[model samples]
Target: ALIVQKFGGTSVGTVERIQAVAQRIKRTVQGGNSLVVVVSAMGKSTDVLVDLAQQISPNPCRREMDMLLSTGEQVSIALLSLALQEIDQPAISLTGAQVGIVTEILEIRPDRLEHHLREGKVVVVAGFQGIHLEITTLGRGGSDTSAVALAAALKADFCEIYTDVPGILTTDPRLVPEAQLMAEITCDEMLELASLGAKVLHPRAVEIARNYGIPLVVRSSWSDEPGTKVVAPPVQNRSLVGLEIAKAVDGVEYDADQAKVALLRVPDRPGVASKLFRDIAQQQVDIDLIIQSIHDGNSNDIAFTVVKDLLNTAEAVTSAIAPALRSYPEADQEAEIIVEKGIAKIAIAGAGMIGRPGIAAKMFKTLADVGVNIEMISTSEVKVSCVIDQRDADRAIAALSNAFGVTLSPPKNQTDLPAVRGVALDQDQAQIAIRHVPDRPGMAAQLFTALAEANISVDMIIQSQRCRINQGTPCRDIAFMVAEGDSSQAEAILQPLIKDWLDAAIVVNKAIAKVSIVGSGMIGHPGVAAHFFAALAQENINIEMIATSEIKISCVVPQDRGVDALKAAHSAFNLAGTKTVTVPA
Candidate 1:
């Protein structure tokens, strides 16, 4: 099989790491596989190049930047090929140019890519930095796009994105310590997760893999673990079901078969709409799911989605002409183009749902009933989507939890979604409490100063008087809170701050997790926690920290046991009994 493996800077981050990666490559080649290995720049070398470009020219031109930054990956190609040769293997290095990656003067269209895998040259293309707009550099982590696009061009069996994390995780490992790894993910969810914050794979590459049904494997460089595999739609030959990869704790589902395009807020008018999109066509953006709003007052928003990296140039192009809006006079830049990022796009995609009547309706109805508003809606023969507000995300997911019937034995059609947990809401009322801060000449100020440095909001501060045994040093427990959601994070943030206080003043403990009642009358009833706790008591689930709101009562269970606790609570609420129940909206 023709395998195209793309290693990120971390995978080939260091010289030692590069040899390790080269060995991995040699094994693949020696194992009877024709290889096309795309390497990213050495660890942080691209960033260093960017810093150099910035230092020389504060507002460096894009074309020149792309030219300058491409060198990083070039270094990798040379070093890796040499490493292969050192081990008695013959290999060749090819730049983007040598491989016939004839991108528009700017690196724009995938169609321009024409590479010959049959040549057996072991094509090595640089990632991240591309030649365009005078060698314009792609956005951070753009190299993954380079790899997948190349794979699509070569028609390879798989595109591998090797990264630092162990495949895709339930949450940022730094935040949720116990986040689980996804063994398999779908293309659509992978794209959405990439766009959201997975950051392991290039968003554009994930999109390309999905659009063309290229299987992508996002594995860690540190190990040979299964990592995560994002396959196309269900293959009758395969097994494993339910939440293959969960982007959000409960919101997004990654399935390659559901890769779709969503176009948002395209202007309405005779030639105006065409004018807006003419560049995308001219530039050849690989677009899908072209959905436009009905024109109202000569203006309406249009939303459609595209595979990753394809939009980078188009977005830059639109922004360049954004100043020309006055010519149309009717065109408004949506009152100012706001790029809302760091939010994962939740999607459910599969070949099974293509003509299955009511599939789309059920998906949306469940979300609407749960009060999650669809910001951008798009669909194709394979997938449908509702761009959602990140806030209503968890509530919508809790509803999907019941709607999709995560707990009950899943139907054969629903087996792909194997995992579900309540999405953790960002704790607006989360807090951090520091205990026993010393009252010295500058000790209190130092404690507050550290918090300020980390930009942690300080509230409800209380200091205790310390009875010094020998001197005037008054050591007292100083307690403060930020928000419930932030408490765990704050504890991590204050580890260094409490290093000195380990003997006397320190963080006793920090907790995170939310438990809530789901009845319609939750907000009106103050006894929801009592009732919920009764359910938990029956199941023998322990609660660590308690926080309550008008509608929901939350408990912080041990991170290790959070999943079991959630499962227990889900059953206690009888939330696990149904298969896609669509309540009246």
Candidate 2:
């Protein structure tokens, strides 16, 4: 099979490393597969080059930086190709421009269709580098983009993105040792991971792959072992990818393919609409899904989605944009912008979803089951998007994944679970992460009062020294994250007063089905632990991960077994006949 393999900066950090990379490619060619190699700058080479350029001037021009940094990857390709030639293998190296790698509009995305076909050799292309009208530099890991672009242009079977790790894992292996490598993944899931903390590949590469339906495998360059392959294909067991697509914006244009525009009713009057739009536009924010109702000789409603963080700014800006009645004698105050908070966006993007039937209804049903209220929605030929409460984001995703039977198998949750389990031993044991108020004297006291009123326990707080403001009013804020279950009520009680406290974002694992094996003497009974775990297996509840403590053991069951795990625990402990004590967590 023909494959395009891209080596990252860390992979080609040194000459010895480049030699090792060349030998690996030689084996691939010897094994009867065609290959294309794309290389990024050596380790710290781009940084050194950038530092040197910046030394000449603090704000070095982008054009000069692009010209200077693109060569880092070029160095990698030349050295690696020379190493291959030393081993008597026929090899050639190509620059981004020498091959058909053309990016435009200041080098963000390049088009190089004609150049890709010309070289047809076991092509080696420089990565993190691009050729627009002039030499251009992509942000970090642009090499990933170079590889995927070439693969799509040539229709390679898969683009192998070589990094230091084996593949996509459940968690950052450095941070969470229990994390396991995923054999395969969906493009959408990887995008979210990449956006958050996963550092294996650049998000732009995934975006390109998702667009062209290209298969992507993130692997280690030093080994012949298989890596994580991200594609859209049916797995052994039934699992459905969710149906929503999100869009990215630049300068108010919906640059991302899956952008949505949701409109709400507003009283349309003379200069009312102009002032409202002018406020948002003045922030230089890119607006998407700008929706408004037709005026019936009077006022009409209007609404739309902008970049996520811009919501708060837009709210404050609009308050000023709407002039008071006496201040604007010719206009009315009722003609205003109604900005809503806590709205979350869910998007599904696929080339095939445009005209598909019942897609929207299925999405709505899944969300509705979890009590998610959709305030506004918009759709397009390739994507469907909706705005919901931010609190519902995690739940909406889990429910949607479950409703569609979505699983990237063989399931990591099934295979990587630790032996023992754990749970909340005492209500007081689990504490909340907290942050202090800024600019307010009694802010921290107010929060303590609210949590105390709600009967919620707080713990493990680390506060910083006072921070400074325009005037020395002894201003400073404390920041920390907390842990609690049914944290909804606690959050609601605190959010209004703590509006600017830290703007905490909450994530709940509703898909998690907990199985706690509790017995006072179980800590000393190894056999008891084994016996209880064996029961879970018989019930089809794969033990995903385990944590333990004196008197209790807890295990996280996969979403598929969410119901079964609870039932199995209830039965094994002889509590099946008892009424289920349930409260929404």
Candidate 3:
């Protein structure tokens, strides 16, 4: 087997660590496998290098910084090569220049690399920097991207990213205790979690892997665990030609069969959604997109979309659960079940949205400009899905196709996968809500586009359902989540637009956490979101906001309860392996 392995900065920081990494490579090569190893700069070395540059000039030219910073990894490659030689292994070290590798736009000349690998020597490559007009450095995701791109171009069996974590955990263990390790996760699921905050792995690397259908393993350098496998499913009709410039969104998905069911004033205690959904599933009603918003008062409102044809049966099944959900049978105490037909769910999906911030904003703006009102929203990192009126389906699809230059395709049914693959908890999220905004078609577009223009990336976005009448115009509230640091800036941008409106007010909550479940198996599976909700309910965690996509469901809760929510959601899906793998401190 041929393999591509990338050791991150902390993994090969010291002399002892370098020798240990060499031994690992020896063992792997002894197993009759070919090796191409990628390594980063020693721990803190890059920082020291940058400090030196800053002392010279507050703002050094990137070209010159690239010249200085590239030395960090150069030192690693040479030391690792010498260490490998001591272990009786034939090894060669090459910088991105020596390997003659470059991005497609710049062009990849990996034939030179293959020639050296064929000489039966372990090839050690300096990552995070690549070749261009002179010498260039890849930023942020540099090394990981370097390794994955090589794996794709070389057609290596799999790519390994040896980092500080045991593997991708249920959540950042530092932020959430009791976080469990995952053996495997879907590519799309990993993309969402990867880009959430302090990254386990860079989303850019995952995007490249997902695009090329390369298997990715994230393992700890100190352990023997198999690690988390990002299952990059086989995609049809794509190749390495112009790989880096691949379309961000190649298809717009349209599903006109969806109908929404919302339950208002359900009990906020444990096991509400579990019992209701388990019973609903027993009757075999296939549930589509399920959304549970943040609780209102002591009660929560839950909503989902079903196939238009099955709306009646879905309604009847929920009605039975509603009666039992109420503690008292009084008229006001009864839960309200809303069944709305004529709804169409429009979506755009691809690996393109991974690093890009404005795709969703542009989508909302496009639809709003076409005079379509967005009724519901759910997002995974790779997708932006909205529930709009069925009457607007044709126009919406056309506008989206033109806006993105992608063909339209109906949503595919893949039931072989599980309904919920993994749970992700983001503790550093802050939400901004614009209340009583004029309920015009472009309102969502205007608000989100402003954030996009400012380069702010949004996480979970929810538009309120209950309509409020301001004077004579009908309006609604719009809420979205961003990184905590962007909360104030987001508010400042939104403040002026609504300053003239008497009823509009901006509410910012910096103390919120979002827990989300993602899976392609979620499609056609009724009550998957309920399973996630039940876990939170068991912990008595009240959801403050709710959003859903065809493959994901997210809920916002108080930051104090975020970890509990992660544990509940993880256990709800039974995603833990037998024993815990220690993540080095």
TM-score of 3: 0.85
User: Tens-digit lDDT track for model 2 on 477-547?
Assistant: 32212244535665566667756545333222334444444433332232444445555666645553333
lDDT of 2 at 51: 82
The Cα local distance difference test for each model comes to 0.50, 0.51, 0.76
Candidate 1, position 81, lDDT:
88
Tell me the TM-score of each prediction against the true structure: 0.45, 0.45, 0.85
Once model 1 is optimally superposed onto the true structure by TM-score, how far is the C-alpha of residue 282 displaced, in angstroms?
A: 53
Let me know the TM-score candidate 2 reaches against the reference structure: 0.45
Q: What does the lDDT come to for candidate 3?
A: 0.76
Per-residue C-alpha lDDT of model 1 across residues 1-585, encoded as one tens digit per residue: 788888888787778988888788778787887788877778788888888888888999766766677777778889998988888666777655445333442343333222443454465655332333323334454577667666666667787878887776544444434456667666654443332234566554555566567788888878888788877753332211111111211223421211223232333333333344454555555333233322223344333334444445546655554444344635654412323332324554443342233445456566756555454433322334444545665676567667754432121232313222212222334334454455333344455555555555442232222312355444544444455545665677667766766344345333434343322233222233444555555555554333322122344444455555555555444433343455999
Error of 2 at 232 (Å): 2.9
- 372-488: candidate 3 lDDT, tens digit per residue: 998877776667888888999999999999998878975554655777766777788888888777776888888888889999888767764654243567766677788888888
